[PDB]
Amino acid sequence: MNIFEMLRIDEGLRLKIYKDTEGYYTIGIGHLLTKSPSLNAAKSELDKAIGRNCNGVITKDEAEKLFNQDVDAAVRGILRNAKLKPVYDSLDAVRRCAAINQVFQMGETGVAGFTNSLRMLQQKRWDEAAVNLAKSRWYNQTPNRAKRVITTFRTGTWDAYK
Ligand SMILES: Nc1cc(F)cc(F)c1
Ligand SMILES: [Cl-]
Numbered sequence: 001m002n003i004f005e006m007l008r009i010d011e012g013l014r015l016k017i018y019k020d021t022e023g024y025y026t027i028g029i030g031h032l033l034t035k036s037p038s039l040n041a042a043k044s045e046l047d048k049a050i051g052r053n054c055n056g057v058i059t060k061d062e063a064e065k066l067f068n069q070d071v072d073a074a075v076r077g078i079l080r081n082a083k084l085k086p087v088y089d090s091l092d093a094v095r096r097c098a099a100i101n102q103v104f105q106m107g108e109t110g111v112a113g114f115t116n117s118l119r120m121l122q123q124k125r126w127d128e129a130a131v132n133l134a135k136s137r138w139y140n141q142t143p144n145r146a147k148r149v150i151t152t153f154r155t156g157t158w159d160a161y162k
């Protein structure tokens with residue numbers, strides 16, 4: 001198991017513009033295109049990202065390319081964040097994949113409001129952090145996914161991903 005396989009399992013893969021769980025336009029492997037409700041804005045955004053007139057559809061390679069750049073950007077966003085970095089660098093490898101996932105899903109922004117959880121993870125209070133993390137809109141809106149990430153942080157193993 002690695003980050004790519006993990007997120008690939010959490011985001012699935014779609015080659016045609018779709019709406020995500022929040023109803024925003026996305027494509028490929030969880031690549032958000034825009035939060036706007038205009039399809040046309042979304043297809044324009046897709047063309048810009050791919051570098052060609054896609055007409056709302058892309059190839060698998062194209063999807064994988066976007067995914068690589070998005071994983072990259074996520075980690076980089078972490079290392080560049082002063083509140084994040086120190087927590088992330090205290091964690092072991094598996095749990096670091098769980099931090100990337102959460103960020104890939106919610107943005108550095110979404111995740112910066114997890115202050116109390118961040119602190120628990122930093123102090124390596126696993127069970128405590130896991131209860132705290134569940135107390136959030138993130139776990140109530142996407143429970144099955146959130147359960148997997150939470151277990152990942154709680155145990156430091158890939159058991160939830162089988
Ligand atoms: N949950 C979490 C998210 C991050 F971006 C970094 C980190 F260390 C923990
Ligand atoms: Cl791009």
Ligand SMILES: [Cl-]
Pocket residue numbers: 141142143144145146
């Ligand atoms: Cl879910």
